[model samples]
Target: SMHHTIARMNAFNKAFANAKDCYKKMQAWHLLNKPKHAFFPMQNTPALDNGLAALYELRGGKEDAHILSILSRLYLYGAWRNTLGIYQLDEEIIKDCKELPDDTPTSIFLNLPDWCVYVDISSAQIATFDDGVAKHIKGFWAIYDIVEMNGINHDVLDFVVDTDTDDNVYVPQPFILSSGQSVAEVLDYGASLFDDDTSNTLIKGLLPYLLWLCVAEPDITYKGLPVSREELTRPKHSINKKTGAFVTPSEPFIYQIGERLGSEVRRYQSIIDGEQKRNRPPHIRRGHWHGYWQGTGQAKEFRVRWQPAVFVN
Candidate 1:
């Protein structure tokens, strides 16, 4: 049956897959092959400490079967639908994920720390029948990752996850920066982006920015005073319009905010079925807000519009 338990497990698997050890080797070279150059590693501050602690407790403080057994907290807390996802490294995306209010625990996560985002490319690692060689020791293949090493300050890592393959679930790198310094401030010009935007020069930057793009925690518990498990998990006395049965939905209902945005994009987005522009003068036209006016009187509203990007095709 499609009860809430089933719904949670299904979504947990999907989110786990994308947020798992997708970046197999990116950390290896910098973590192992590289010399042990620094001593100070990132220490978790109370903000993240309290935040992560709150999450585990929200699930009863007991480890689950798959460890992610309690990811249902996010599904319940954020009202995420039981859906599958395989997030891709969207070169065109950066810093769009910062939408949570200061009240949310996840917001604390973004306010602090630099998260590493990665994507898979057509490299020799996975490129067996590449049409050519020497793809030139580099170019962003739309990849993603979990840790970060500020070789300059050398305070980003304490112990490296010594796995040499994808699907290795060992570490989740949380970046802690030196006082009065940050790629977001130095390069991004002191802008409050989706937390941070550290461009490693105009060349291979876009790491922190793109990483924030995929985070989607919208609901918060500031008003939890007037709420309970029944209220938070399901709408009371709900009825299926199709079946006239009064019951909670088999799967969680996505908050109006997330679902509405998702639907709006489904209209304008150019759905991808796997195609990369190999030779065509590549230039991914980034997306921007398309504004619109509604209503005549002070009852007017400016719709939040998001026009998807035109990729290099």
Candidate 2:
């Protein structure tokens, strides 16, 4: 037991040292003036895949399909975890208490804790007749409002269907409006839309929600997004279990947030969409068959040697 514990401690120390070294490298790289693709390889496999997929999708069959396919899955499956850091000085409302008049809407809204912010839409879908309108709608508020209103703490939101007989009982009765509807309409038409099964999937799925977001929250920007609606909806590569190639309609919110946030936020170092382990380089064979047997026999049986059986990034 003591030996095992010591081994684990040693591995942890080594891994932590590696992480520290990587952070220092990143800090150093930030200071340099680099050319395009000069610093690209430093990015782990997922980021590389995602970038390639985006570029390939934009370029289509004209580019290298094999690389695009590999990169797509690599980026899609790498797991990500988020850690929230407090920015005490960035809390503006507390510092600006003297500038606000009493009972003002802005002051009331600003005073609300970040966790307490909520928005309830009246309609399940918001639409416009204009071409390229849905892209804008889908990109902005689909997942944003879902998280903002219902609370982001939950693991699942958008476009999920339940086959259970007690589906009626399982559903949440939040006042969400259809696309193209205002707050007043959402409040007034909430019951009517609730009874409509056709719009239920639209409200629940990520795609329709994104479409609604693009149309509904035109002014809202999450993390410096400034793109046309057409660009937002274009088919992109997503990791699928069956095929390694770039796939279409790869859950935009997941792709966008996972790709961008993974890079920007250190806590989300790996953006894993699911449980799949990423591919890694093969280990170099150290000896021939006889040498392997001799090496194994020579090693002390009491001492345990463990490394990742395979390194999956």
Best by lDDT: 1
Per-residue accuracy of model 1 over 1-313 as CA lDDT, tens digit each? 4433334335554764532222122122323444332211122111223344465556644453233322322212111121211123222232233222211121222221112112222121221112463222111211112223334433331111212222222222223222234333433443222233222232113232222222333211211222222343332334356753333234432211223333334433433322242333334455543434565787543333345555454
Off by over 4 Å in 1: 1-86, 90-154, 157-176, 182-199, 202-204, 213-266, 269-313
Per-candidate Cα lDDT values, in order, are 0.28, 0.25
| Residue 309 in model 2: lDDT | 17
State the displacement of the C-alpha of residue 19, model 2, in Å, after optimal TM-score superposition: 33
Candidate 2, residues 1-313: lDDT per residue as tens digits?
3222123324433643432233333323423533121111222332333454466557562366554334322221111001010111111111111211111111111111111111212122333222442311111111111212233221111221111121111122232332333322333344333445444433433221122122311222234464344543333334355643223221222212111222222222233322225643322111110101123767422211111112233
What TM-score, computed on C-alpha atoms, does each candidate reach? 0.24, 0.19
